[PDB]
Design a protein that fits this description.
three-stranded antiparallel beta sheet, mainly alpha, Arc Repressor Mutant, subunit A, DsrC-like_N, monomer, Dissimilatory Siroheme-sulfite Reductase, Chain: A, domain 1
Length: 112
């Protein structure tokens, strides 16, 4: 129960659901290896969003849900690039859920 991934020969602790629990480091290799297992390729678009969540959660202590991410990325990335279809075209498994997975963030649902 709960497994460790292989990055640079280092054992990083991730939740068995595929979410990095050890947020005491996180390197690009972590996200890449996790993406490989999902067959999702990470372009500069993905990496911008991944780094965004990484930074956002680290500074704000807040994990942006799908309703929030779409707004934030819209202003951050460009003019109005934050589109629902765009997010689904990047993460076909679920925009916010897939992004945070690679960003090394825990399952974000919150008190709704």
């Amino acid at each position: 129960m709960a497994d460790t991934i292989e990055v640079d020969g280092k054992q990083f602790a991730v939740d068995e659901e595929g979410y990095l629990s050890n947020l005491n480091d996180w390197v690009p290799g972590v996200a890449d290896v996790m993406a490989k297992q999902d067959n999702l390729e990470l372009t500069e678009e993905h990496w911008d969003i991944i780094n965004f969540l990484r930074e956002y959660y680290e500074e704000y202590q807040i994990a942006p849900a799908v309703r929030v991410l779409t707004k934030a990325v819209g202003k951050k990335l460009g003019k109005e690039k934050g589109n629902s279809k765009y997010l689904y075209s990047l993460f076909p498994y679920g925009p916010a859920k897939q992004a945070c997975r690679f960003a090394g963030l825990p399952k974000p649902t919150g008190c709704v």
